[PDB]
Amino acid sequence: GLPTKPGPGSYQFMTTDEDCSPCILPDFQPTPEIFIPGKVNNLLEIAQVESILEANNREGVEGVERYVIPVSVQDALDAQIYALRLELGGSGPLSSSLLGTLAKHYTQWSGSVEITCMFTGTFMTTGKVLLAYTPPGGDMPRNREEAMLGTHVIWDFGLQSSITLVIPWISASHFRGVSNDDVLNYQYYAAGHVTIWYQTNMVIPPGFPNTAGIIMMIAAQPNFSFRIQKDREDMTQTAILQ
Amino acid sequence: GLPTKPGPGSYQFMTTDEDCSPCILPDFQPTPEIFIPGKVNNLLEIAQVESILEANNREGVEGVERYVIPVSVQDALDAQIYALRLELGGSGPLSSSLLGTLAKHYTQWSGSVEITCMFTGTFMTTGKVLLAYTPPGGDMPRNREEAMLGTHVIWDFGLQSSITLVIPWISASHFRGVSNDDVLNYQYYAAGHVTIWYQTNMVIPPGFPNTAGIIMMIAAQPNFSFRIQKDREDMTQTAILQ
Amino acid sequence: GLPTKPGPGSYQFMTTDEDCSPCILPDFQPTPEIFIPGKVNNLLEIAQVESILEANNREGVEGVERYVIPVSVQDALDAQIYALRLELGGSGPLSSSLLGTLAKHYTQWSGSVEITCMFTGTFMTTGKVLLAYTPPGGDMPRNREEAMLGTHVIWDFGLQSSITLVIPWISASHFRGVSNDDVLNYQYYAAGHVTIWYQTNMVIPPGFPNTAGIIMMIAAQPNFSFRIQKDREDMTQTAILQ
Amino acid sequence: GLPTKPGPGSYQFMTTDEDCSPCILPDFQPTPEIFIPGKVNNLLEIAQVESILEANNREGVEGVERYVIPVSVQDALDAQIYALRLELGGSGPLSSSLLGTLAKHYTQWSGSVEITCMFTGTFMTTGKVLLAYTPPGGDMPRNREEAMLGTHVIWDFGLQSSITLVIPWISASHFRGVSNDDVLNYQYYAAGHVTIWYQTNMVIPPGFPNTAGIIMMIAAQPNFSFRIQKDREDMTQTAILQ
Amino acid sequence: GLPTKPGPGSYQFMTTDEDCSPCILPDFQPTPEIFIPGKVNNLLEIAQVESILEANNREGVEGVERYVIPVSVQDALDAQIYALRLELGGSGPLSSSLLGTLAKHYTQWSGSVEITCMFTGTFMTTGKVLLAYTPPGGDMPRNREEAMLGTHVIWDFGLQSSITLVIPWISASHFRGVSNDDVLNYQYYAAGHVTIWYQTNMVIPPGFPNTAGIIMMIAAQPNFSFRIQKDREDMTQTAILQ
Amino acid sequence: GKMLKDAIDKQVAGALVAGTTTSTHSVATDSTPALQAAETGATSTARDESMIETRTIVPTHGIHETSVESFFGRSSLVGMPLLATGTSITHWRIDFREFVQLRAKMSWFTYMRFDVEFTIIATSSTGQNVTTEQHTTYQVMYVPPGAPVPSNQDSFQWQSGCNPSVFADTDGPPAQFSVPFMSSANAYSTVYDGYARFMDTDPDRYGILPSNFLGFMYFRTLEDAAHQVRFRIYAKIKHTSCWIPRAPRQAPYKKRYNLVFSGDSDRICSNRASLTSY
Amino acid sequence: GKMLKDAIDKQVAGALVAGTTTSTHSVATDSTPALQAAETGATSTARDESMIETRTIVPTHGIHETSVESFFGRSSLVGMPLLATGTSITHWRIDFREFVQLRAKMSWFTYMRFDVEFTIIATSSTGQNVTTEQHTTYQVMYVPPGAPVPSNQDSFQWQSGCNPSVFADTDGPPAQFSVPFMSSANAYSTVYDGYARFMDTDPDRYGILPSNFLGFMYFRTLEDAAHQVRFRIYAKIKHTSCWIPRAPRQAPYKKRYNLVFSGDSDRICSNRASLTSY
Amino acid sequence: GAQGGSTINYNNINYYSHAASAAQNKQDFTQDPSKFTQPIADVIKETAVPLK
Amino acid sequence: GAQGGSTINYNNINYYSHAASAAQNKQDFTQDPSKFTQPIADVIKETAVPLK
Amino acid sequence: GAQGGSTINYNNINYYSHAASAAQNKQDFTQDPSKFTQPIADVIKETAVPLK
Numbered sequence A, B, C, D, E: 001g002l003p004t005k006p007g008p009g010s011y012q013f014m015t016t017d018e019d020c021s022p023c024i025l026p027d028f029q030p031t032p033e034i035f036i037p038g039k040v041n042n043l044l045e046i047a048q049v050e051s052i053l054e055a056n057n058r059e060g061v062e063g064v065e066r067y068v069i070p071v072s073v074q075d076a077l078d079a080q081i082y083a084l085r086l087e088l089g090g091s092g093p094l095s096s097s098l099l100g101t102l103a104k105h106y107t108q109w110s111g112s113v114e115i116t117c118m119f120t121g122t123f124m125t126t127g128k129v130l131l132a133y134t135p136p137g138g139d140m141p142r143n144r145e146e147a148m149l150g151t152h153v154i155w156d157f158g159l160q161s162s163i164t165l166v167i168p169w170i171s172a173s174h175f176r177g178v179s180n181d182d183v184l185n186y187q188y189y190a191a192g193h194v195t196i197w198y199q200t201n202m203v204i205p206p207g208f209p210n211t212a213g214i215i216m217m218i219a220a221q222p223n224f225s226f227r228i229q230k231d232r233e234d235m236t237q238t239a240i241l242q
Numbered sequence F, G: 001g002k003m004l005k006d007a008i009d010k011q012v013a014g015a016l017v018a019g020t021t022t023s024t025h026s027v028a029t030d031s032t033p034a035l036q037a038a039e040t041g042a043t044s045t046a047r048d049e050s051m052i053e054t055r056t057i058v059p060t061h062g063i064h065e066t067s068v069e070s071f072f073g074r075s076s077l078v079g080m081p082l083l084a085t086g087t088s089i090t091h092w093r094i095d096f097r098e099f100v101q102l103r104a105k106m107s108w109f110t111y112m113r114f115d116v117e118f119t120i121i122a123t124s125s126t127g128q129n130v131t132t133e134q135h136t137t138y139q140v141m142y143v144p145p146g147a148p149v150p151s152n153q154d155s156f157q158w159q160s161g162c163n164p165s166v167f168a169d170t171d172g173p174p175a176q177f178s179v180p181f182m183s184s185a186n187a188y189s190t191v192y193d194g195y196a197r198f199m200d201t202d203p204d205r206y207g208i209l210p211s212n213f214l215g216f217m218y219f220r221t222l223e224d225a226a227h228q229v230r231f232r233i234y235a236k237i238k239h240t241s242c243w244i245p246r247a248p249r250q251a252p253y254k255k256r257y258n259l260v261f262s263g264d265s266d267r268i269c270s271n272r273a274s275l276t277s278y
Numbered sequence H, I, J: 001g002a003q004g005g006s007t008i009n010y011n012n013i014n015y016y017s018h019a020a021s022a023a024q025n026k027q028d029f030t031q032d033p034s035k036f037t038q039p040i041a042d043v044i045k046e047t048a049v050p051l052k
């Protein structure tokens, strides 16, 4: 026999092993692969697809209505429409989206994200909106004067119903932590703020609905990636399923 | 010694292993192989051989008589001769044939089957018969009008004693389940119906036997195969044989 | 380390293993091989050497005399000299010869055997002898008329003292079983009969010895072989030797 | 399976093993390596950097002052400034330097060492100093007459503030022991003496500071090396750190 | 993982194993090899060096005197000087020599041996000596007439102080056993006798020392070798050394 | 040799993420990349470079940890049958639906074609479930649909002449074996909008695709167990094809053989008191 | 084959130490190698040959035992979690700061990029800590930040569908596995002169760089333990890049997450009574 | 691969007969994100207005 | 290397897919001691006076 | 030998240094039966009478 020295790690089972193993049915010949539409080779093809933010997460809003941010006729200038901490982890609105639910399976992320907004008011309803991205270091911008100092787009309601604010990868490091784990101070990875402001006002003809909606949508850009698989927090069980 | 890492599955015995193993008689030199007629390399050579269906499985029929379906002079038009659920599994008439007994050793099947019928009446006895195959979705056809809507052959009794109804592989999937396992809903794999009808009538000269027989025979076509070996249900023992 | 999977048969000791194993004296340099006469490479070189049958195995004959079959002046015609069941196993006369003792170490045999007989009467003593080999199926031949129907040689006593009856390999199968194991019905392998008869008579001058001898000798032909080593029955011990 | 013979040392864990081992994250793709200044490939690049000797190790001197050897105006001729046993081990002044702290991690050393001295008196302060290296065999030199018989440099205070005494590798063997382990008689490896003497005197203008300092510095030459890693004596713990 | 079958001898430790094994210090770089005089590659270079026989092993002789065989003026003719059983084993005079002490480490020996004798009498002392080697089979030769029948040299005392009797390898077998193990009858390997006789007489001038000495010396010839290492009998201990 | 070259496949993970080109300011009425129309169903085409002034970034990040192979290519628990000492026999119905982590990972796709590596860890314990010593062989028998099931520890079904079995020791290394894609269909289905049977619309056969069900694993000890044995069954999905991504499961799983959920409070992410502050 | 040539790297340690050239006496005003100026911050350039008369020495000594790879390239203890029998669960926070020998070796550098080989030795013992017999599988689960932690021995988190796990036997060979450089940063940092968070300057977040922290290892026995288990966690640092050497740690370590020291007596080397005698 | 950067380069060696025995595939396969992101009959280039 | 002197010569054979699995690197890498010993804008040759 | 008939064809691979470590030899060696069966000075061809 060939002299050998089995070493440490002998007979262990690692769940991420990449080893060949004997087939219990070595003569089996599977059914052919047929053409099926929509073959996926990499889950970042899904992450680049837009999905709707559960953006209207105010206490008391249930169901489909959590998907429409209110936008109204204002009686005061430069008012705020929306505020959102840029986070792939945690439990805020981004966490339940396609990108957010993929991020639940991963520990680290990098790359640019885009947010596409669609206005749902009547044809006759006009308005201009400021969408701002504030890099980290401080708090959420308090007024439109402070928010405009950051990356921002200005949206004119019109025939083209939707706008994109690209949130570019602006970062001290090549990767950030998905989670906000407190004991581990993963707030170190704070990724900034997204805020929405009235650039002029929502204006309506007499007797029209004085309230309309924005449907926010989010997706990853082609420069985006995830590392380190991890267990999804909110997919649990207390018993074996029967 | 060469450093190694024995992994999981070490020292297990799998009954389908394909491994070399030391010969307890390494100097033995066997007797030559001689020519013998009828060498078999693949059990689908047996499955393509016709065998007789135990088709007359009515309660009370014993022995050789279970192999002859009665055919009589009818006093009414368009009567039914036979009905059979197309099934390689279970315990109906197909289960005891050569193809059916091979199917007892396998879990899945695909391909076309043929049924050859031989009439055994006197030379002077005439008749025409309709043999129908109904694809699944409903019940057994209730009358010859409904059965004729399917795949079917029409048989004229004459010098050529026998007919073939080819039951073609008509199937949503590439393979079906052999068994009808209830807990697992293998009725999903229902494969249709075979029925036999009088196309005209059996007609005899005065004082001849008013009853004759069909001997049904079944075999696999060359497009047929089996997968997944499994234990035969009805080959059991309660004790070691002595 | 190289990933491995030790399988079944790990750490077993099989007595017929063919494996290399570490040498406890790896620097030793043995004495040269010198020429010695009579090198043996294969035990069938021994089996082709003639040896004497313990042929006179009658109850009461002891010692060297068991090696001489009596041959006498007969007072009746066509008498029998000897009878012997052709068997490499068991405990009859062939079992103690060189070929028989080698067969004790083996389970199966094939090939032709020869029996050489040497007459030991006086120069003046004459005779003719019939040596018969009867293929199996029945009993020992009862008279010289029945024995002559088989393979046989007729021996004339003269200057050339000896004769060969070649018992040719006549057999339904390529090999026979050495043993006559009853529980296993190895009598299936019955190999026939050898008998010796007076072809004329032994004739002597007045007052000569009226009894002389045949020394029977046996050996294997070059078409002979053995299979399956097995333990020798009669080489036993009840205690460790001291 | 390939026949094998696991030998001695099977399943042991040696802390200095050089073996490949399965990666628990085989699909991970690390962040790129960026340019960082000051990449170190070998700890002897650190050992060739000068560091300050904790040379004024007199009982009662604390803090930064342990780094300045006093030098004064003498009232007598040929006085001694400093004495130091040449030792990379133990606990004397060399032990806390960069070279000495690296030597704490190693068992054996070879090569030349250099000592650079910097005078810190006023611009107007003059002096000449004798720096001596005495190879082993005896004691520390008792007077400047005895010390001068060895390797030595003579230092003139002036514009170039510093001097080097190169302590050359002078040794019966290719390597010495770092430690002075008594039970093992590692005093066998005694490496000699370094002493400093007034070659003339320190001379000052009227009313200047009559005391100044030498800052001693040490480093390895390019012909220096260490062998056999060993545990650092003075880096201990009584409890797990929390 | 590669399928394997560890066999018998797994995990054993054999003291003569020739296997590679992991180095506990894989980065160590040893000191160079320097030139040293007298490098030995094979212990038979030592065995070919002459050493002094402890030849005067008479009861009562202690110390250096055991190295000088007495030689005297004889008052009778053809007297015996010395007798010695040719043996590399046992405990007689050859056992404590360089060749004998090497033979203590080995089980078997072959080859020619030479014995060199040096006379130590005064310049004026004359004599002739017969040195005999008797091959085995009988006893020690009893008189010079019997001893001369063997291999022998005749030594004339003179300017060349020394003589060689070559004891040639004369032997039924290629090797002999070193030991005289009684239970194993290693006296089978008896290797003969060496005896020394006065060929004429020792003759002296008046009043000279009437007794002088022979210093016997022994060594192996270039055709000599040893096999099978074995433990040295007389190098023992009752306790661990402290 | 070339024959051994057949048993080696050189396979490479070197696909990179997209890079960034430097861009400058744009003042025009020609190019309006920020104006979109989500009504079409297309995702926004606007990129970094067209929205702000970018620098150049050379791509350095891999994508391989989110390849479908890497995402599924690890072992997960799928079955935990307990062998008691009264009968010394147990079984596990083969599907990946008892334990939620693998099931939820599979819920990202509709059709999935893969092989499986199974790994079985056996653990012996007392009645109070404290680890205990027990050295015994056990037998895992694959029992496909229509093969008779063993009813006892000594049933002659464990002959295993045609069912494949694995024999391993309770205190030895874990049993491990691979399995090809076995469906009669050309992929497995994670979700099924149909009935298991013709001529039947019972709710208990809605969503049941029996071509996902390849039968049972049966477990005995080769002698009668002295202590209870727990088998943990792990599956690693490999050589994976995936089609038709889905909205992933969000409500907790409740039943093994259907998608029933509570749906009492219609929300997923947590609430706040005001949309304009955190 | 060339494909197998890809899995082999021929790598050589044959760098030698500097040699010595013979030199002769020098009487001049031209060349003054012994005059130095430490004020520049440069180390002395003077060599043996220019200070005394040297012979020639051919270099023979290697330098490889002080290569950064060799200096770090051995295993050291970094974690010793104890699994009690009450809950049969424990964990270890992953960093090299509990045990001082490896931490002090790392303190010679600022930034370090490496891989890790981990080795786990499990030992069972009684309450009085005497070795005892216990054969049981254990599970080590890598739990990265944001993954829910197991709270019990039977928590369904140990499913491990996405967390990697290693299963090994308490009385089997040691579990061993490798790990690539996992930091979000381009190196690890041995020391950090900053805060873990924006908008916060709490002393407990000074010197805390959370990109060094990759999470937790969690440990259970697969049944409830009969005796306590001690896991010893060893790390060997390999494939090592090092930047920016430092003054090494001299005061003893006191806390896991900061550099606090006593500093009561300002000295390191021992004292003597007089600078001109030993 | 004894290292390029983010290139894992593996020789999968299967020791058993059936392809299903082989370890997991490490190839990166083609990504066609646009079958999901741009699933529309008429391409809309980034610089154009989408509607009309 | 069955021995040159102080030359260890090793064939690191990694059996696993990820480069991180490989054993430790035995190469000697370049030493630039002068980035730490001579970290000064103007080189000072040994035979010169340092200042001025 | 994956089978010719009665031909066993073996590659004896010894892993140890000493030839004595090798497994058993499978060669068939020359048979000279006639040194034992015909050990006589004058050959006697089968068809001849032996004596005279």
Ligand SMILES: CCCCCCCCCCCCCC(=O)O
Binding pocket: A024, F094, F095, F096, F097, F116, F142, F179, F182, F188, F212, F213, F214, F217
């Ligand atoms: C034990 C050997 C044969 C067992 C076959 C196991 C194949 C399992 C594939 C399961 C695919 C369907 C998953 C599901 O229905 O949720």
Ligand SMILES: CCCCCCCCCCCCCC(=O)O
Binding pocket: D024, G094, G095, G096, G097, G116, G142, G179, G182, G188, G212, G213, G214, G217
């Ligand atoms: C268990 C698999 C993933 C675990 C990752 C372990 C990587 C450890 C690197 C530690 C580097 C920082 C050291 C420190 O902070 O002191």
Ligand SMILES: CCCCCCCCCCCCCC(=O)O
Binding pocket: C002, E002, G004, G006, G007, G008, H001, H002, H009, H010, H011, H012, H013, I014, I015, I016, I017, I018, I019
């Ligand atoms: C028993 C036959 C030995 C063949 C195995 C050679 C080593 C496996 C090849 C691994 C290839 C990828 C390794 C790598 O470069 O990262």
Ligand SMILES: CCCCCCCCCCCCCC(=O)O
Binding pocket: B002, C002, I001, I002, I009, I010, I011, I012, I013
């Ligand atoms: C299982 C495939 C066997 C390949 C291993 C061959 C031996 C390893 C190579 C070691 C190379 C360095 C050894 C040395 O010369 O010091």
Ligand SMILES: CCCCCCCCCCCCCC(=O)O
Binding pocket: A002, D002, J001, J002, J009, J010, J011, J012, J013
């Ligand atoms: C570890 C190196 C692997 C070399 C062993 C290859 C297989 C052994 C050769 C056996 C040759 C005779 C087999 C046969 O054809 O019957």
